């Protein structure tokens, strides 16, 4: 990834381990794929010149090792009682499998490691943590037909990930609490349609992957670093900050589309109350999105005087502005898509 | 294996009787104040041996643990040669030992088998 080819090797074994996990027709192959993914993701997220990155790596290690051992325990119990790879009728060992998967995914009430560890990271490893490391536990939740435990996780995730993100002014913990709130929308789609979950995950990872690039290039680790961020035209900062209204679900931006397809598929499947509970949740998420959006919508700011030129990478800022165009004017591609039929 | 348990308990019993017979027949003199002290070549210690010890071969120890669980996958294939496909057995065995040689020679090239210092 950065500064070493061995990090590219670690990304390769990361992709290999996650794709080994999600393709497994047995829980043991999924478990060993999670072991490969954990092995790959410990060395990225470790840096000896940072005192808090090693603590974040330790928190990730302890949380994933506890969650992987409970997952193997209840998998072995499921094989002990109902000798095939699945269960005919739902029982408590399926709930233990789902709880051990929810500790890996970071959903509430097992969410507490996730923003407490994200303070120790950079932005690229944060993006790998809250997008790709949610492929393997969320795709394994799809094999379990449990409604009450998943519904409790959905309600707790959308309540906590909205409320909890109000207090932090640091962008990493705020974006982690935003990822907890968007995890509840993914888990709410997981028991109605796996394709609609894949679409919400792809567009959420797209909006995460374009909002990381604005913070990775300019090194914006705090809320007032946005207010002190220098741009050569204030209309450019006004346009670049529209991706938070996209991630808040405001039409006519691109991020209204995955929330909208989740709402359409939930109402077709006759769920209305938890959908209404997720309406009140995303207003608070849009509220703490707007405190970032204070830094560009007032058009003139009392700014620091010493900095005069802004600097960026070539290929990273070139790839950033392709997706910022599609995160604003992405609803003109509504006719091109054919997944949703 | 039940006989091995009983004879291991008998060897442990016999060694405890031997040590207790060495303790009973030992000369029983009074314990002096500075007789019981740690030796430290005849002088005062200045530090307990429970002081933390510097580890210069931590990488060698974890590589030893990794190589030992690699030993745990070699030991089957003595038996498996007579009962399997010869082609698959040779591809697995020569590829196993060549991957171990790549790893060991690569860490020899980096100098990670040398003690930290």
């Amino acid at each position: 990834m950065f500064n070493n080819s061995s990090k590219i090797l670690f990304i390769t074994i990361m992709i290999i381990g996650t794709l080994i996990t999600v393709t497994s027709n047995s829980w043991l192959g999924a478990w060993m794929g999670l072991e490969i993914n954990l092995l790959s993701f410990i060395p990225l997220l470790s840096d000896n010149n940072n005192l808090m990155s090693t603590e974040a790596s330790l928190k990730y290690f302890l949380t994933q090792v506890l969650a992987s051992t409970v997952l193997l325990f209840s998998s072995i119990l499921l094989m002990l009682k109902n000798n095939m790879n699945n269960e005919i009728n739902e029982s408590f060992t399926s709930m233990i499998i789902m709880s051990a998967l929810l500790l890996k995914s970071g959903a509430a009430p097992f969410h507490f490691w996730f923003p407490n560890m994200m303070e120790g990271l950079t932005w690229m490893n944060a993006l790998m943590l809250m997008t790709w490391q949610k492929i393997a536990p969320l795709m394994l939740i799809s094999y379990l037909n449990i409604k009450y435990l998943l519904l409790i996780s959905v309600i707790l995730s959308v309540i906590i990930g909205a409320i909890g993100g109000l207090n932090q002014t640091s962008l990493r913990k705020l974006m982690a609490f935003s990822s907890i709130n968007h995890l509840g929308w993914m888990l709410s789609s997981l028991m109605i349609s796996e394709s609609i979950w894949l679409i919400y995950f792809f567009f959420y990872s797209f909006l995460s992957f374009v909002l990381t690039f604005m913070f990775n290039i300019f090194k914006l680790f705090h809320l007032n670093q946005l207010f002190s961020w220098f741009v050569n035209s204030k209309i450019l900062k006004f346009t670049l900050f529209m991706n938070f209204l996209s991630l808040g679900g405001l039409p006519p931006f691109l991020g209204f589309l995955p929330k909208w397809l989740v709402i359409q598929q939930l109402t077709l499947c006759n769920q209305y109350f938890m959908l209404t509970l997720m309406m009140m949740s995303t207003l608070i998420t849009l509220f703490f999105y707007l405190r970032i959006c204070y830094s560009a919508f007032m058009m003139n700011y009392f700014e620091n005087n010493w900095i005069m030129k802004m600097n960026m990478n070539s290929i990273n800022y070139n790839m950033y502005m392709i997706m910022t165009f599609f995160s604003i004017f992405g609803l003109f591609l509504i006719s091109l898509f054919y997944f949703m039929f | 294996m039940f006989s091995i348990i009983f004879i291991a308990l008998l060897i442990l019993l016999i060694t405890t009787i031997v040590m207790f017979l060495a303790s009973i027949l030992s000369k029983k003199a009074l314990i002096d104040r500075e007789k019981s002290s740690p030796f430290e070549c005849g002088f005062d210690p200045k530090s307990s041996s429970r002081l933390p010890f510097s580890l210069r071969f931590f990488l060698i120890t974890i590589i030893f643990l990794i190589f030992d669980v690699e030993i745990a996958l070699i030991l089957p294939m003595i038996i498996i040669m007579k009962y399997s496909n010869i082609m698959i057995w040779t591809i697995t065995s020569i590829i196993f030992i060549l991957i171990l040689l790549i790893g060991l020679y690569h860490e020899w090239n980096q100098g990670m088998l040398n003690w930290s210092n």
Partner: protein
């Protein structure tokens, strides 16, 4: 500009995290083990005390 948006009684005693994400570890003093090759040691020839 605070550590959080709303400082509580416990929370307001905190400081701001650094704007650079990298925090270098400090260099702390180390007290090494004091072992003497005393006089009884055969490598110390009988009457040498090396306070290593």
């Amino acid at each position: 500009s605070g550590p959080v948006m709303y400082p509580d009684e416990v929370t307001s005693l905190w400081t701001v995290p650094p704007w650079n994400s990298k925090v270098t570890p400090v260099e702390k003093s180390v007290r090494n083990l004091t072992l003497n090759f005393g006089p009884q040691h055969p490598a110390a020839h009988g009457v040498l005390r090396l306070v290593l």
